[PDB]
Design a protein around this ligand. Structure first.
Ligand SMILES: O=c1[nH]c(=O)c2ccccc2[nH]1
Length: 154
């Protein structure tokens, strides 16, 4: 049993937009934009909504790039995270209550202040490969086990 979440990475050939999370789950970490999917909206529409909410931005098209399932020891609900990607954005990243957006060079991606799974699956993101992931967490810092597989169909 699982719960739907979104994750949106604005990926430009020289840079990638991340946002610093100021409160709530996983605060004090750089991350993609997104959150819970609501009843009555599609997964992609939820991904867009959260992008607009957290960074101000709107996009033409969002591309499905992966799916990562997260399991936390002691929590029965799984996180079913649908990952999206886009180069073309409309507007300017501005700050919100949830996220402080900031651009990063592709050779300065701040992995040590990101969720530790990001080390594993970013290579496939940057190479424009579609993927299915699973990561079992113990607390916020410790990956007990994982799988990561390139797929053709997300
Ligand atoms: O890149 C990530 N973003 C997340 O929101 C996240 C949430 C829970 C576990 C890993 C995560 N990894």
């Amino acid at each position: 049993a699982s719960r739907l979440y979104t994750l949106v990475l604005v990926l430009q050939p020289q840079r990638v937009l991340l946002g610093m999370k100021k409160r709530g789950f996983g605060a004090g970490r750089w991350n993609g934009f997104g959150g819970k999917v609501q009843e009555g909206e599609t997964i992609e529409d939820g991904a867009r909504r959260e992008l607009q909410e957290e960074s101000g931005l709107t996009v033409d098209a969002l591309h499905k790039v992966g799916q990562i399932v997260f399991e936390f020891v002691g929590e029965p609900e799984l996180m079913d995270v649908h990952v999206f990607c886009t180069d073309s954005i409309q507007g300017t990243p501005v700050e919100s209550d949830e996220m402080r957006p900031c651009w990063f060079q592709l050779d300065q991606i701040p992995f040590k202040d990101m969720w530790p799974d990001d080390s594993y699956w970013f290579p496939l993101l940057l190479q424009k490969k579609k993927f299915h992931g699973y990561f079992k967490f113990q607390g916020q810092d410790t990956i007990l086990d994982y799988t990561l597989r390139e797929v053709d169909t997300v």
